[PDB]
């Protein structure tokens, strides 16, 4: 079995930024697209980005491109995304998914709640 | 950046009769390669969210087949028949053709 | 196998109130007390109250008493917490958890977001 | 209200590299009848916390060896033998002899 393991929950003041991680094992780290989605309140879930392990390239949704940032460490598998700048509506669980291919998020951490 | 909408956006359903949850893409969804990213997942009280259906009618691994979808070019529906305790929860379509991906904005099921 | 599961994730306006439902399965629900606990991100875990399943006697936190309000459904084993006047510092998961006899806290609810 | 007192409130252990929690009830804790109900819950991230020890010592089910808990009257202890990357998480001493039953402030314990 995989896993996708997260940081724990956090409280940020605002203005603040926090990092979360998501370290996963069971598959095969770099050869799979990382994707951090968030469910924030009266916005159900989006998009925010993703990163490739093996190539460390990344993408961001423009909502989020001036705050957030993505990285990820191939020694101890895992992945990162910060969110700088932060206010009341980013109150919401954070998490990762990796994407299959022929469809998308199949596996999912399991989640970080940030206030 | 497809505007996705479901609907309707609560979908209160009597344990055993089934369940059906629209969804309506604001363009074409399908990929140049021909496929078309729609999908449906399913977000349990309190779990991450899970993948239950992809390109369009295709059931995931593990998937009971209750669960089904349908529709084309700009319409999709997703399909309960027999809804049971453990479909509740709150249902999202999903876009992955066009960049950014997006999701509806959740059908919440309950008994 | 026994196991609480709780009503889904909720969003609500500043003034309202909110209802958690938990569901007992597996095992003989009146025999044991039901707490609620919630985890706000400020201060870890606390303790709101409990109540007992067979004569739906009741304790609450003294930071609850005046909001709060335990009550249960034997017909269906189902134990519900009602938090009324929410505030921003209400913003947190509460959990159900049910009580092992030596131990407080046996087999806790997946836990119920509240925003 | 008994008030738990932990120290420290962040332990980055070092792996493999023993571990030890302090708690302090403002009051002795023993119940009317002969049970101190002192006890220990870990809250791994974004998991329900779990009981890990309660009677002060006595480890839950299928909790490791390499926990175990000491103390009586006002000082407690928890302590893990080799701190593996799976034990991270918030820490809590709990004492539930007395209502309201108290928890401590936390101790967040990382790699």
């Known amino acids: 079995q995989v896993q996708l393991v997260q940081s724990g929950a956090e409280v940020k003041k605002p203005g603040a930024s926090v990092k979360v991680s998501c370290k996963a094992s069971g598959y095969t780290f770099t050869s799979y697209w990382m994707h951090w989605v968030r469910q924030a309140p009266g916005q159900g879930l989006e998009w925010?980005?993703?990163?490739?392990?093996?190539?460390?390239?990344?993408?961001?949704?423009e909502k989020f491109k001036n705050r957030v940032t993505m990285t990820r460490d191939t020694s101890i598998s895992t992945a990162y995304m910060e969110l700088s700048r932060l206010r009341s509506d980013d109150t919401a669980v954070?998490?990762?998914?990796?994407?299959?291919?022929?469809?998308?998020?199949?596996?999912?951490?399991?989640g970080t709640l940030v206030t | 950046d497809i505007v996705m909408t479901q609907s309707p956006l609560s979908l209160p359903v009597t344990p055993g009769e089934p369940a059906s949850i629209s969804c309506?893409?604001?363009?074409?969804?399908?990929?140049?390669?021909?496929?078309?990213?729609?999908?449906?997942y399913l977000q349990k009280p309190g779990q991450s969210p899970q993948l239950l259906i992809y390109k369009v009618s295709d059931r995931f691994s593990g998937v009971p087949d209750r669960f089904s979808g349908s529709g084309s070019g700009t319409d999709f529906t997703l399909k309960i028949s027999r809804v049971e305790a453990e479909d509740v929860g709150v249902?999202?379509?999903?876009?992955?053709?066009?960049?950014?991906?997006?999701?509806?904005?959740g059908t919440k099921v309950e008994i | 196998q026994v196991q609480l599961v709780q009503s889904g994730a909720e969003v609500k306006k500043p003034g309202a109130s909110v209802k958690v439902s938990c569901k007992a399965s597996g095992y003989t629900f009146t025999s044991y007390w039901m707490h609620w606990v919630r985890q706000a991100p400020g201060q870890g875990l606390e303790w709101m109250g409990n109540?007992?399943?067979?004569?739906?006697?009741?304790n609450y936190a003294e930071k609850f008493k005046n909001r709060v309000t335990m009550t249960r459904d034997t017909s269906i084993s189902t134990a519900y917490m009602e938090l009324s006047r929410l505030r921003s510092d209400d913003t947190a998961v509460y959990y159900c958890?049910?009580?092992?006899?030596?131990?407080?806290?046996?087999?806790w609810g997946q836990g119920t977001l509240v925003t | 209200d008994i008030v738990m007192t932990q120290s420290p409130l962040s332990l980055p252990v070092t792996p493999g590299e023993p571990a030890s929690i302090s708690c302090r009830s403002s009051?002795?804790?023993?119940?009317?009848?002969?049970?101190?109900?002192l006890e220990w819950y870990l809250q791994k991230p974004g998991q329900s916390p779990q009981l890990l020890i309660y009677k002060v010592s006595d480890r839950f089910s299928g909790v490791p060896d390499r926990f175990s808990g000491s103390g009586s009257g006002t000082d407690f202890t928890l302590k893990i033998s080799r701190v593996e990357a799976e034990d991270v998480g918030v820490y809590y001493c709990?004492?539930?002899?007395?209502?309201?039953?108290?928890f401590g402030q936390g101790t967040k314990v990382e790699i």
């Open positions: 009051q002795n804790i023993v119940h009317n009848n002969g049970i101190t109900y």
């Open positions: 109540i007992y399943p067979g004569s739906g006697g009741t």
């Open positions: 958890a049910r009580s092992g006899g030596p131990y407080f806290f046996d087999y």
């Open positions: 709990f004492q539930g002899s007395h209502i309201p039953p108290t």
